[PDB]
Amino acid sequence: KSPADIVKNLKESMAVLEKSDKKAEKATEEVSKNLVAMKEILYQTEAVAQLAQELYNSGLLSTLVADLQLIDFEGKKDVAQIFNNILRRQIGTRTPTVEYICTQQNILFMLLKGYESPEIALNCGIMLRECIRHEPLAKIILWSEQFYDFFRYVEMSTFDIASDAFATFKDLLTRHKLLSAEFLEQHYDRFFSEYEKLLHSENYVTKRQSLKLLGELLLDRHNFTIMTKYISKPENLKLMMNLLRDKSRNIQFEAFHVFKVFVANPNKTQPILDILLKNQAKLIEFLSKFQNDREDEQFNDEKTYLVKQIRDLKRPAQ
């Protein structure tokens, strides 16, 4: 019937699925039909308004996420599509679904945990990335302990799911600049301790993507304090220098981008300057020959700049 009726029926069928065969087959068919009916409402401006209000009030939005594993293949995608549409609802300047989730945070924790269930992981990723577009929801996820679960997810043996988790992880770290910069600063030690492990991943993809994201993070103006701290640690310089000799050409190239940051720094700590001086002639020679086959031009100009930087390295006043 109306939005309220569809919401009531869907809530009842969901209840049956949680409780088979005859009864289960009917409830699954009824769930599928109601989800399709809800989509038809989305595509009466007040009908949509009514559906949203009923969705918040009844707790059905939350139930659809909690029970996603129980829903059929196409039905799971319909939940994602409905959720993604309702999430963007606006009333004047307000986004009611975002305010709603801020007081219903378990929706986010359940979606995150969903990465651990093969049959719902990608749909959870889709909904999570839509949530992440809203700074308050990105914040809840980023400050949560569950954020560290991404370090496990991107190292998962099922590479497609690991790649999807990485896209979510990257979005969280790069979309809201001030928010990400404040997070990285406040949890610097734990975050980089975990990230350092990604740079040794056996999944060549996770490793390459992790090195590329590190470069992007260090170069954003909002992350200046984090960058300054990262390029002050001998162990980080060591790792980047060793990656310049990685068996993978792409890895070496991504490592070169971070390496440049360490060298361009006008105020190096002594442990950093000492490593560069200890390898000065070797670095000059190495850079003069580094992937000289590669015509990038921006790359060639960077090598010219780094060779001069290394040649000009000097100990300051004691």
Binding site: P234, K238, M241, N242, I275, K278, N279, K282
Partner: peptide
């Protein structure tokens, strides 16, 4: 090799 590099020397650290």
């Amino acid at each position: 090799d590099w020397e650290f």
